[PDB]
């Protein structure tokens, strides 16, 4: 049907935008500077970022671990108001990471993306409210884009105050700021200036005192005020465009809100506005008009790099400016070149930073294509400008019914962040103001003509109208059918009739988002469960060859396609040379590359063998250590058109998404294993290499001038022999491609250890061996434990090797090690319907109940389903699958199989089965009696049972966080600094923390020594620790503990704070009072 | 149009929560005396209004208001707060002093007591009921334990005798014990109205300052205690832990 | 344990503060004080010699090494360095020394001051913005002398007025009153220190009887402090202070970081600050700068100090390179993460291991899986011990090495070390005592923890990916009581309610159900007859009857049937003992026959299983 516009452009667009202009306009707005005395102009033709060009392949920049960027010149102009003379130059000022294929950026060689967030929009708003009785004040409030605010209200007088921040101010003269005659807001309001008139105290004191003491006796107190004062005060605060952006929006709303008339770019405000407000406030004291609800998606706005950036740049400037302001100005009239008077830096920071950190330069994560998408078109509420988790609570997390269509409600982390992080509906997108125009369909006489290329309007939910939910039994040829078609309307649903209706949704699955509108039979499940679903889907590792599932929602080919994890017919051509690393159908020069000569790009390699030499890349690490690669996939000599797709990303398959596989499942209660939240598995499962994935691995290490010296990298190290000085290069590195194991050496380096501190007993033991011992710690690098796996690579980094290292390091070495992994007991692994499950036993294949045809089934989940999960949806499709599994044919589908009085999905599926018999007559393919139930024997001995069990194929999926990702142990190890208690943090020998509630399970029990000791000897009596340890090594018990540390610490503090702690004993018959350490 | 506090889901913890701290936000025009007369509805009233209550063995009329969210109706054979007269949670405190208004004849103890429990009991149930609201089971035996813990502190008054300032909310024994002393060695009788200390007031700033400190007021109680030297032998548990040595039980209960 | 009984909370008088860092030496001349705010040197890294890390007053970071040098070994211990005055005493002597700063200006302890009751004020009977003014240099006070003339006691001269107090100068009549205009805490000092107070709690208590309906709350308060002070030895003046303790350095440790960069601690930072401010100020009075600087100054100092104690308390939260509020002394021992509540009730021990979890069928209850990988480390040592016992391993490093080699013993000895040796498991923080119990560690392969269904409810576990965590007990005694009283067997039932808590819960119920249900139409082996032996069983494997199939069974015992039938029905009055009588279940022989010679039960052949299964598990 429709056309899915590109679904990430969201941020393609933005950037381009900016780029295309989004900063010129700022820029040259900031172009005009000039001496401190108007006498020496410093303006520039800010209308060209004249940017020379990126230096690196992307690839490079990865390899160089550098920030793909650009850099960027501004021609400037003829300077000075003393003798008007140019000393013209241009300048670049900074490097700009000019985006990437995935519409994101990479920097420092890593890979990141900038989320886009969502905030309220400048303009004005009113909130009224009650007392404890019903005194129903109002308020008002203003927000620039940037700059302070202006607050108003009505405090049981009906008489009012121009508060500025929260309640900073409060003046009866709410509208007597910079206006004489008074009538301008006494009669020009033609309403109720202070309910018709005047405050009580409508005193009109504002002659020479105008803009004086108002901004002093109850502002900003404590100075001999000065009518200037007050003035130069306000006018700052609202007039230097310097600091008050309304925001195009700003206007744009206003006016709209108040059909003010001020178009005018009037990027900052007026008076007439102000009052205009105030009226409105009044008018509704009298109640003529509406308070405003910010929750309404419409009056709330989302913004992306384009400006996030941009403005952040602006501040870059200002800072810069100053520097210049003087450095340019104050000094003499010659030296001042349009060159050494400007410096990047501050910009280069600001951005270098912005990216380099915000909360928005998030890392990408490329687990798998759709984890991207959905992480680009994610949008967020938090962030600087936003909220915090705390400072915003709840009803600000809910489905304001305007989200409809615009924010998949199904979609959310949790943790606290529920609600704070939504993603984007499928079809949504945004208007240059940064509200989400929502595609729809114009139904005439309550009937969509379809022809309409949708209806890209309804940026806000208040189209206000008959709007139909894109799930309508629709008469062929337009007409709706039921005279009871619902509709939202003014945020309400409402029984409607087909005639008097306007708007239909383009589809019944738009409000949802990625991983949500994809559920095979969504329509049929709990929501939340489907929540989980989605997410799981994002976490499915990718596999050697993730197969396109069987029953899928149609909607995906695209999704893949726009990952940009695949490789797409750029243009056009009929393949020729395609080895497994590129498709020289490209730089070769024949029909591929040459209808890559049909029509022949602007600058690009317009005909020849073109750098349509796409490479294609094997096994690169991911933000999750997962590997990716795109085998040629296409044949040779054949015919492709742009947008087609050439080779496949990690886990996509026919050029379409493919997240996991599909295997035959049964539902029964296998004793113990599977008993509950447990899954069985045949052995063939991973025996066929299905479900095994890759993972690979960064390992770097580096050497560094101790002020003892260097420390190095030798082949040689003391104390070696096999797994040491064996699988080791001349610099003690490894050869590419070397098995390794769990303790062997990655790279060996030593250290200038020397001595200068030793126990006589060590000197002894020399003497006896009189070994003149060596002197060099030897921090080789060893594979830790529980790793395997070939080595892919190394990446040395020293003066010559890029020298990318901390100040004073010599070599840095990366090393990369990969790893197949089969499945194995212990792996979250779940379906597309919140089917969180863990492997428990694997059965050798010849024990599972197989099938009537003996085909051994192979998972076996628990039958009783759709409980709290309410995900009955998944049987539906199992079944289905199985149909297209026996029929051996994939089938797309869509949630909400409506236009059918009955379940529809229900008589499909049967139908298919049904007929599936007879195309093979296998018969047991389908049993109307006990639908899709089957007999089953069971391998172990050879019988079915009283109750036939359903059977289906089904698409499962295996999940990143893998057992090894969470395993730990610690006999003992490194402690803390200050507080010596073992160093528990996850990577490295950590330790289980026993918080109060945990101790509340110990002292709550009976004999609690343990408690005690646990509190100490395995965490603190320092000496206690040791010598226990010992004491067991001895072979006996352990000695009595002492007092833990952290006590002693507490002493200290407290003592360090005006105390006289006398912990102390009271001994002797003379009872003796002492004190202690 | 007035409308309901109906729905499908009601009270839950926070209900608990509250009465556990025994917060005092429960409107309750319960009088401090039993009566027994007619009290048509509002009291006397019924015509447009008069929310109001008994003086049966008495003559005074009395008459306190009430809202349109809580409406009362308990006529005749009325309550010595054998019910909170005016019928919305009387607040164990109001009920306690009411069970003290009615309970002030016996031994000031037994007035206290019979009240005192009276309420307690009360309290307990209350709680159950929430549990049964969910059916969730919690041995009343426990609850007991707490709530007793919750209320065994008097608040002194005219404490010129027991020294405890007239108003020095203190424990039940010591003061009453000191009362006995003066009671047999000359002196007044510091009032002992049995009061509840809620949840948080209970614990925290109490005997051992360490505890407290750790629980809360790490720096708040700290000041003070500091002003008092208030020694803290950490005798008991929660310290032994803080501190390492073991527990009032264990060998401390064996060797002991 | 037997080192002390009770603690003595209180205050640190300037002597006691200066008594936190004297470290007087045998050269005979005292130290402990720090004359520098900076940290380790730039060239080398050694601790200056009077800065935040001066060794000679905290201690030789390099065990027995006079910062000077000359001695680099325990041999030189009691003996110190002539030249440096370093106190040669290992290095653990640090982390405990303390040192302190003589203050160039007093600072009203933040704590007593902006406190909930502002005790200072409570005792000064002077609200904030008045006594708060006095610090902060912001007003003046008359002083007892200052107001001996027209001036009224505790009248805030602020400055203009104070200057007007300088106006109407003694060059005129009167003005013979005194001075001590309270511009700074130096005077708040002798406010406090002024007052006697034995009169309070008695002469003041004169009120307390009086003013029956008066404020009351005010007074009694003001008492109880006073009283208290006098009752303790607390002179309010001690509250303001004058000399400052200082944390043994390493707790403000500061540290070389691999990459060369360093790990500064906000402690030394707040500190050092106040140092400057101090010194400098001393140099300001030394240069006799005109007040208002020096004034200003103190003001500052003041609150440097302050923040140190407690950032963000009152003035503007300090924000350093941390690009955020710093971390004052208070707050590191406060909150959710104050020392108390997390390192102290909750420390973070070793000898542990976490993992995912999985049903452990085959493995019975009171057992646990255990991966091999983790089980080692948990048990590390114990095993090595056994090595040495078996003698196979000689030294330990021997072992160590061998342990990594996973010699047969590594997977042979171990598990002899292991059984018997309970272990404790827990699913995340668990208030409930039963939340964690004792368990027998059985080895197991993959990496999960096997886990029993019956215990699942207690811990309340999914198996959707939960995780648990293990610890292991050491003393032997601590083993005992694992066994003895947490051993997950023996605790069946909720401590919150006698109810059992082990309960076969799902499907296993419905096994049993389905076992024991009552399929209708049951024909195969229905109405059959049986007599003990588990006969009927056999018949069952020979399907002589159907799992669901009513059939008589000779059993002289008691039924319970549900749906009691006790009374007869249709007794069969025929001959000997033949009333012989039915029941909706039973069928029996009394009268002449005897008492119950017949005893066939109307029960399905499943239920018999069940009954059996209990039975035998139970007695025998």
Swiss-Prot record, chain A:
Catalysed reaction equations from the record: RNA(n) + a ribonucleoside 5'-triphosphate = RNA(n+1) + diphosphate
One of the GO BP terms on file: DNA-templated transcription
Keyword field contains rRNA-binding: no
Cystine bridges: none
GO cellular component: a single term: DNA-directed RNA polymerase complex
Chain segments annotated as coiled-coil in the UniProt record: none
E.C. designation(s): 2.7.7.6
GO MF annotation list: DNA binding; DNA-directed RNA polymerase activity; ribonucleoside binding
Annotated signal sequence range: none
Leading EC class: transferase
One Pfam family named in its UniProt record: RNA_pol_Rpb2_6
InterPro entries named among the record's database cross-references: DNA-dir_RNA_pol_bsu_ext_1_sf, DNA-dir_RNA_pol_bsu_external_1, DNA-dir_RNA_pol_su2, DNA-dir_RNAP_su2_dom, DNA-dir_RNAP_su2_hyb_sf, RNA_pol_bsu_bac, RNA_pol_bsu_CS, RNA_pol_bsu_protrusion
Keywords, alphabetical: DNA-directed RNA polymerase, Nucleotidyltransferase, Transcription, Transferase
Domain of life where this protein originates: Bacteria
Family: Belongs to the RNA polymerase beta chain family.
Subunit field text: In cyanobacteria the RNAP catalytic core is composed of 2 alpha, 1 beta, 1 beta', 1 gamma and 1 omega subunit. When a sigma factor is associated with the core the holoenzyme is formed, which can initiate transcription.
The protein's name in its UniProt record: DNA-directed RNA polymerase subunit beta
Lineage of producing organism: Bacteria, Bacillati, Cyanobacteriota, Cyanophyceae, Nostocales
Designated gene of the protein: rpoB
UniProtKB/Swiss-Prot annotation, chain B:
Residues making up the signal peptide according to the UniProt record: none
Top-level taxon in the UniProt lineage: Bacteria
Function: DNA-dependent RNA polymerase catalyzes the transcription of DNA into RNA using the four ribonucleoside triphosphates as substrates.
Assembly and binders: In cyanobacteria the RNAP catalytic core is composed of 2 alpha, 1 beta, 1 beta', 1 gamma and 1 omega subunit. When a sigma factor is associated with the core the holoenzyme is formed, which can initiate transcription.
Family of the protein in this entry: Belongs to the RNA polymerase beta' chain family. RpoC2 subfamily.
Name of the protein: DNA-directed RNA polymerase subunit beta'
Organism, as annotated: Nostoc sp. (strain PCC 7120 / SAG 25.82 / UTEX 2576)
UniProtKB/Swiss-Prot annotation, chain C:
Function: DNA-dependent RNA polymerase catalyzes the transcription of DNA into RNA using the four ribonucleoside triphosphates as substrates.
Gene from which the chain derives: rpoC1
A single MF term (Gene Ontology): DNA binding
InterPro entries (UniProt xref): DNA-dir_RpoC1_gamma, DNA-dir_RpoC_beta_prime, RNA_pol_asu, RNA_pol_N, RNA_pol_Rpb1_1, RNA_pol_Rpb1_3, RNA_pol_Rpb1_3_sf, RNA_pol_Rpb1_clamp_domain
Reaction(s) the record says it catalyses: RNA(n) + a ribonucleoside 5'-triphosphate = RNA(n+1) + diphosphate
PANTHER family: DNA-DIRECTED RNA POLYMERASE, DNA-DIRECTED RNA POLYMERASE SUBUNIT BETA
TM helices/strands, residue ranges: none
Organism: Nostoc sp. (strain PCC 7120 / SAG 25.82 / UTEX 2576)
Gene Ontology annotations of biological process type: DNA-templated transcription
SMART domains in the cross-refs: RPOLA_N
This enzyme's EC code(s): 2.7.7.6
Protein name, per record: DNA-directed RNA polymerase subunit gamma
Residues annotated to bind Mg(2+): 462, 464, 466
Quaternary context: In cyanobacteria the RNAP catalytic core is composed of 2 alpha, 1 beta, 1 beta', 1 gamma and 1 omega subunit. When a sigma factor is associated with the core the holoenzyme is formed, which can initiate transcription.
UniProt keywords, alphabetically: DNA-directed RNA polymerase, Magnesium, Metal-binding, Nucleotidyltransferase, Transcription, Transferase, Zinc
Note on how the cofactor is bound: Binds 1 Mg(2+) ion per subunit.
HAMAP family per UniProt: RNApol_bact_RpoC1
Cofactor(s) it depends on: Mg(2+); Zn(2+)
Gene3D superfamilies per the UniProt record, alphabetical: 1.10.40.90, 2.40.40.20, RNA polymerase II, clamp domain, RNA polymerase Rpb1, domain 3
Gene Ontology cellular component annotations, sorted alphabetically: DNA-directed RNA polymerase complex
Protein residues bound to Zn(2+): 66, 68, 81, 84
Similarity comment: Belongs to the RNA polymerase beta' chain family. RpoC1 subfamily.
């Amino acid at each position: 049907a429709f056309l899915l516009p590109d679904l990430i452009e969201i941020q393609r667009s933005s950037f381009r935008w900016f780029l295309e202009e989004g900063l010129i306009e700022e820029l040259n707005s900031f172009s005009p500077i000039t001496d401190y005395t108007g006498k020496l102009e410093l303006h520039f033709l800010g209308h060209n970022y004249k940017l020379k060009e990126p230096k690196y392949s992307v690839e490079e920049a990865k390899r160089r671990d550098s920030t793909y960027a650009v850099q960027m010149y501004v021609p400037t102009r003829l300077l000075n108001k003393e003798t008007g003379d140019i000393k013209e130059q241009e300048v670049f000022i900074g490097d700009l990471p000019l985006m990437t294929d995935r519409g994101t950026f990479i920097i420092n060689g890593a890979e990141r993306v900038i989320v886009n967030q969502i905030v309220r929009s400048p303009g004005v708003y009113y909130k009224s409210e009650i007392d404890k009785n019903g005194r129903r004040t109002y308020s008002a409030s203003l927000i620039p884009n940037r700059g302070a605010w202006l607050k108003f209200e009505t405090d049981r007088n009906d008489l009012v105050w121009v508060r500025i921040d929260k309640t900073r101010k409060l003046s009866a003269q709410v509208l007597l700021k910079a206006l004489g005659l008074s009538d301008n807001e006494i009669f020009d309001a033609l309403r109720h200036p202070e309910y018709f008139q005047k405050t009580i105290e409508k005193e009109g004191q504002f002659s020479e005192e105008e803009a004086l003491m108002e901004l002093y006796r109850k502002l900003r107190p404590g100075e001999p005020p000065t009518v200037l004062g007050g003035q130069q005060l306000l006018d700052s605060r609202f007039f230097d465009p310097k600091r008050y952006d309304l925001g195009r929006v700003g206007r744009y709303k206003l006016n709209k809100k108040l059909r003010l008339s001020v178009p005018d770019t009037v990027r900052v405000l007026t008076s007439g506005d102000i009052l205009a407000a105030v009226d409105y406030l009044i008018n509704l004291e009298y109640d003529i008009g509406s308070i405003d609800d910010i929750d309404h998606l419409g009056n709330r706005r989302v913004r992306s790099v384009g400006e996030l950036l941009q403005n952040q740049v602006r501040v870059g400037l200002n800072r810069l400016e100053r520097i210049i302001r003087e450095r340019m100005t104050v000094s003499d009239a010659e030296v001042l070149t349009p060159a050494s008077l400007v410096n990047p830096k501050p910009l280069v920071a600001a951005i270098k930073e912005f990216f380099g950190s915000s909360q928005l330069s998030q890392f990408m994560d490329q687990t798998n294509p759709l984890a991207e998408l959905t992480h680009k078109r994610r949008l967020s509420a938090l962030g600087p400008g936003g909220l915090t988790r705390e400072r915003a609570g709840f009803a600000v997390r809910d489905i304001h019914p305007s989200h409809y269509g615009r924010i998949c409600p199904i979609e959310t982390p949790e943790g606290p962040n529920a609600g704070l992080i939504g993603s984007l509906a499928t079809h949504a997108r945004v208007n240059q103001y940064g509200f989400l125009e929502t595609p729809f369909r114009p139904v005439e006489n309550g009937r969509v003509r379809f022809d309409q290329p949708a209806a890209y309007m309804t940026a806000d939910e208040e189209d206000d109208l008959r709007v139909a939910p894109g799930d309508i039994p629709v008469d062929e040829n337009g007409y709706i059918i039921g005279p009871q078609v619902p509709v939202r309307y003014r945020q309400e649903f409402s029984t409607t009739t087909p005639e008097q209706v306007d708007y239909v949704a383009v589809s019944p699955v738009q409000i949802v988002s990625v991983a949500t509108s994809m559920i095979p039979f969504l329509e049929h499940d709990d929501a939340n469960r489907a929540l989980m679903g989605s997410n799981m889907q994002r976490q499915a590792v990718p596999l050697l060859k993730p197969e396109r599932p069987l029953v899928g929602t149609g909607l995906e080919a695209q999704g893949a396609r726009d990952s940009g994890m695949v490789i797409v017919s750029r243009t056009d051509g009929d393949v020729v040379y395609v080895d497994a690393t590129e498709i020289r159908v490209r730089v070769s020069g024949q029909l591929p590359t040459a209808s890559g000569k049909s029509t022949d790009n602007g600058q690009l390699t317009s005909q020849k063998g073109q750098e349509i030499r796409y490479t294609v890349s094997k096994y690169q690490r991911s933000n999750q250590d997962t590997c990716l690669n795109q085998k040629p996939l296409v044949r040779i000599g054949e015919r492709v058109v742009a947008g087609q797709v050439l080779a496949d990303g990690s886990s996509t398959e026919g050029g379409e998404l493919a997240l996991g596989q599909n295997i035959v499942v049964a539902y029964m209660p296998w004793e113990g294993y599977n008993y509950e939240d447990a899954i069985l598995i045949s052995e063939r499962l991973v025996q066929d290499d299905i479900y095994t994935s890759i993972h690979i691995e960064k390992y770097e290490i580096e050497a560094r001038q101790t002020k003892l010296g260097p420390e190095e990298i030798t082949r040689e190290i003391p104390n070696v022999g096999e797994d040491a000085l064996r699988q080791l290069d001349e610099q003690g590195i490894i050869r590419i491609g070397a098995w390794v194991e769990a303790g062997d050496i990655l790279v060996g380096k030593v250290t200038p250890k020397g001595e200068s501190d030793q126990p006589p007993e060590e000197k002894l033991l020399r003497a006896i061996f009189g070994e003149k011992a060596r002197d060099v710690r030897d921090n080789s690098l060893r594979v830790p434990n529980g790793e395997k796996g070939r080595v892919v690579d190394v990446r040395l980094f020293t003066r010559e090797q890029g020298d990318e290292l901390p100040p004073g390091a010599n070599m840095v070495v990366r090393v990369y090690v990969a790893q197949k992994r089969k499945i194995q007991v212990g792996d979250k692994m779940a379906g597309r319907h919140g089917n969180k499950g863990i492997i428990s036993r694997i059965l050798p294949i010849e024990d599972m109940p197989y099938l009537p045809d003996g085909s051994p089934v192979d998972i076996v989940l628990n039958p009783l389903g759709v409980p709290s999960r309410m995900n009955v949806g998944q049987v539906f499709e199992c079944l289905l699958g199985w149909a297209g599994h026996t029929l051996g044919v994939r089938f797309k589908i869509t949630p909400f199989d409506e236009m059918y009085g009955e379940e529809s999905s229900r008589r499909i599926v049967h139908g298919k089965l049904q007929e599936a018999r007879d195309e093979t007559g296998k018969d047991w393919v389908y049993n109307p009696d006990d639908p899709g139930k089957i007999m089953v024997y069971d391998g172990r001995t050879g019988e079915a049972f009283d109750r036939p069990v359903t059977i289906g194929v089904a698409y499962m999926l295996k999940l990143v966080h893998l057992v090894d990702d969470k395993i730990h142990a610690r006999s003992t190890g490194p402690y803390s600094l200050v507080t010596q208690q073992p160093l528990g943090g996850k990577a490295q020998q950590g330790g289980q923390r026993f918080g109060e509630m945990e101790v509340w399970a110990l002292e709550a029990f009976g004999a609690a020594y343990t408690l005690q000791e646990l509190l100490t000897v395995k965490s603190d009596d320092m000496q206690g620790r040791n010598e226990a340890l010992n004491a067991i090594v001895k072979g006996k018990a352990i000695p009595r503990p002492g007092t833990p540390e952290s006590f002693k610490v507490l002493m200290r503090e407290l003592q360090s704070l005006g105390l006289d702690i006398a912990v102390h004993k009271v001994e002797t018959q003379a009872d003796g009072s002492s004190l202690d350490v | 149009f007035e409308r309901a506090k109906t729905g499908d889901i009601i009270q839950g913890l926070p209900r608990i929560e509250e009465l556990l701290e025994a917060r005092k936000p429960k409107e309750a025009c319960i009088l401090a005396k039993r009566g027994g007369e007619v009290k048509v509805v509002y009291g006397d009233g019924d015509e447009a209004i008069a929310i109001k209550v008994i003086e049966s063995n008495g003559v005074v009329t009395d008459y306190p208001l009430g809202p349109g969210q809580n409406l009362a109706m308990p006529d005749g054979s009325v309550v010595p707060a054998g019910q909170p007269l005016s019928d919305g949670p009387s607040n164990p405190h109001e009920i306690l002093e009411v069970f003290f208004s009615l309970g002030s004849e016996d031994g000031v103890y037994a007035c206290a007591s019979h009240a005192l429990q009276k309420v307690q009991t009360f309290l307990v149930n209350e709680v159950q009921m929430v549990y049964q609201s969910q059916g969730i089971d919690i041995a009343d035996k426990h609850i007991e334990v707490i709530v007793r813990q919750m209320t065994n502190k008097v608040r002194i008054d005219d404490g010129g005798d027991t020294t405890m300032l007239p108003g020095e909310l203190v424990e039940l024994r010591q003061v009453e014990q000191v009362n006995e002393a003066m009671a047999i060695t000359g002196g007044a009788r510091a009032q002992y109205t049995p009061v509840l200390l809620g949840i948080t007031k209970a614990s925290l700033n109490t005997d051992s300052f360490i505890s407290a400190a750790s629980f809360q007021e790490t720096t708040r109680v700290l000041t003070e205690a500091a002003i008092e030297g208030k020694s803290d032998w950490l005798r008991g548990l929660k310290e032994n832990v803080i501190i390492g040595r073991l527990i009032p039980a264990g060998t401390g209960y064996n060797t002991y | 344990t037997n080192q002390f009984d009770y603690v003595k909370i209180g205050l640190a008088s300037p002597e006691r503060i200066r008594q936190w860092g004297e470290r007087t030496l045998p050269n005979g001349q005292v130290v402990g004080e720090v004359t520098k705010p900076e940290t380790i040197n730039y060239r080398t890294l050694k601790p200056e010699m009077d800065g935040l890390f001066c060794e000679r007053i905290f201690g030789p970071a390099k065990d027995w090494e006079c910062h000077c040098g000359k001695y680099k070994r325990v041999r030189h211990r009691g003996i110190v360095c002539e030249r440096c005055g370093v106190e040669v005493t290992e290095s653990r002597v640090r982390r405990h020394r303390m040192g302190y700063i003589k203050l160039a200006a007093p600072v009203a302890h933040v704590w007593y001051l902006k406190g909930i009751p502002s005790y200072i004020s409570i005792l000064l009977d002077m609200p904030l913005r008045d006594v708060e003014q006095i610090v902060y240099f912001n007003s003046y006070v008359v002083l007892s002398p200052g107001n001996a003339e027209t001036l009224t006691y505790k009248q805030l001269l602020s400055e203009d007025q104070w200057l007007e107090i300088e106006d109407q100068i003694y060059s005129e009549d009167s003005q013979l009153q005194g001075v001590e205009v309270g511009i700074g805490a130096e005077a708040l000092l002798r406010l406090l220190a002024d007052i006697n107070l034995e009169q309070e709690a008695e002469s003041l208590r004169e009120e307390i009887g009086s003013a029956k309906g008066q404020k009351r709350a005010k007074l009694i308060k003001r008492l109880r402090v006073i009283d208290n002070f006098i009752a303790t030895g607390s002179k309010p003046e001690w509250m303001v202070m004058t000399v400052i303790p200082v944390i043994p350095p390493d707790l403000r440790p500061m540290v070389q970081l691999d990459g060369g960069r360093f790990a500064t601690s906000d402690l030394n930072d707040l500190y050092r600050r106040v140092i400057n401010r101090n010194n400098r100020l001393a140099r300001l009075q030394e240069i006799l700068a005109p007040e208002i600087i020096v004034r200003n100054e103190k003001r500052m100092l003041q609150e440097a100090v302050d923040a140190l104690i407690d950032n963000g308390r009152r003035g503007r939260t300090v924000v350093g390179a941390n690009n955020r509020p710093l971390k004052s002394l208070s707050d590191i021992i406060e909150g959710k993460q104050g020392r108390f509540r997390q390192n102290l009730l909750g420390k973070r021990v070793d000898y542990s291991g976490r993992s995912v979890i999985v049903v452990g069928p085959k493995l019975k209850i009171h057992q646990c899986g255990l991966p091999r990988e983790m089980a080692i480390e948990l048990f590390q040592p114990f095993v090595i011990n056994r090595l040495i016992r078996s003698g196979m391993v000689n030294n330990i490093k021997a072992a160590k090495k061998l342990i990594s080699r996973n010699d047969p013993s590594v997977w042979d000895v171990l598990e002899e070390v292991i059984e018997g040796h309970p272990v404790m498991l827990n699913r995340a923080p668990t208030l409930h005592r039963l939340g964690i119990q004792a368990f027998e560690p059985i080895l197991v392969e993959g990496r999960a923890i096997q886990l029993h269904p019956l215990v699942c409810p207690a811990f309340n576990a999914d198996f959707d990916g939960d995780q648990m965590a293990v610890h292991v007990p050491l003393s032997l005694e601590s083993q005992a009581e694992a066994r003895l009283l947490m051993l997950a067997s023996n605790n069946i039932l909720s401590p919150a309610t006698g109810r059992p808590i082990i309960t076969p819960s799902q499907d296993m119920v419905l096994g049993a159900y389905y076992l024991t249900a009552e399929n209708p139409g049951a024909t195969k082996g229905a109405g059959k007859y049986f007599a003990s032996l588990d006969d009927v069983i056999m018949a069952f494997q020979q399907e002589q009857i159907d799992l669901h199939a009513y059939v008589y069974v000779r059993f002289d015992g008691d039924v319970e049937s549900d749906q009691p039938d006790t009374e007869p029905v249709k007794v069969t009055t025929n001959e000997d003992g033949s009333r012989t009588v039915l029941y909706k279940y039973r069928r029996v022989r009394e009268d002449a026959q005897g008492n119950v010679i017949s005893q066939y039960i109307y029960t399905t052949p499943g239920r018999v299983i069940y009954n059996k299964a209990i039975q035998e598990a139970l007695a025998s």
